[PDB]
Design a protein around this ligand. Structure first.
Ligand SMILES: Nc1nc2ccc(Cn3ccnc3C(=O)O)cc2s1
Ligand SMILES: [Zn+2]
Ligand SMILES: [Zn+2]
Length: 231
């Protein structure tokens, strides 16, 4: 049963089996008066592991590495942050030290720099315009367009029909748009139309924060976004 934020002390990381050679990774961090949970993904890359997103923090990300050695036992060799916020890039410095080559789109790198966040080393190309798709080892990386922010990526594991939505996909229980500082509310529903065109098969869809679901999370996220602009 998927862990909730109440169950995960800040500084601990949990791993959850979505499908064979596919895990999400759940951690917790303080922010705007509370502590929030945050999701990333892990994919078996042959005899290696591909990570998607940090654990929101240096000490957390290092507890992620430790739980991955304890529980899987193969080496993380690459990581991909999916947009520029520290719940995606905080910890890259730790991953770097740990042997992991860290990647992000060219925008994602510049944005974080300005915002003072940590900076993935390598640049990912082919991802410049709404709807580009590129192949990263055992996954496909997809830029559906401006959404939670203007740089966010989504990830699809074809062999498992798992789609990792990141923060541009909300969980079902979330009904308040939230901090929409850097989002594009006008384009975000259209961005979610693309996802739904390019990944009609998805079996499970993993939000950036909270419980996984199906493709329902997409019409949910859209209803949540549009409600926010009519008031
Ligand atoms: N019911 C819920 N409400 C909220 C409100 C704000 C957030 C904010 N947040 C922090 C880090 N990333 C985000 C983000 O929005 O991606 C998440 C949830 S989950
Ligand atoms: Zn964000
Ligand atoms: Zn987030």
């Amino acid at each position: 049963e998927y862990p909730t934020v109440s169950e995960i002390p800040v500084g601990e990381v949990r791993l959850y089996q979505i499908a064979d050679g596919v895990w999400s990774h759940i951690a917790t961090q303080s922010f705007d008066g509370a502590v929030y949970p945050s999701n990333g993904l892990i994919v078996r890359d042959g005899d290696e592991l591909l990570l998607i997103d940090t654990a929101w923090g240096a000490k957390n990300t290092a507890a992620l590495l430790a739980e991955i050695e304890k529980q899987i036992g193969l080496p993380v060799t690459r990581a991909v942050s999916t947009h520029f916020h520290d719940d995606r890039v905080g910890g890259v410095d730790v991953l770097r030290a740990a042997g992991v080559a860290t990647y992000a789109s060219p925008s994602t790198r510049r944005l974080a720099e300005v915002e003072g966040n940590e900076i993935p080393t390598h640049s990912l190309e082919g991802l410049s315009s709404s709807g580009d798709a590129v192949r990263f080892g055992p996954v496909e990386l997809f830029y559906p367009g401006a959404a939670h922010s203007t740089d966010n990526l989504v990830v699809y594991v074809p062999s498992a029909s798992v789609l990792y939505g990141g923060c541009a996909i909300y969980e079902l229980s979330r009904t308040s748009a939230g901090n929409v500082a850097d989002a594009d509310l006008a384009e975000w529903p259209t961005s979610i139309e693309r996802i739904q065109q390019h990944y009609p098969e998805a079996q499970f869809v993993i939000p950036g924060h909270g419980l996984p679901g199906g493709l329902d999370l997409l019409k949910h996220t859209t209803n949540v976004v549009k409600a926010h602009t009519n008031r």
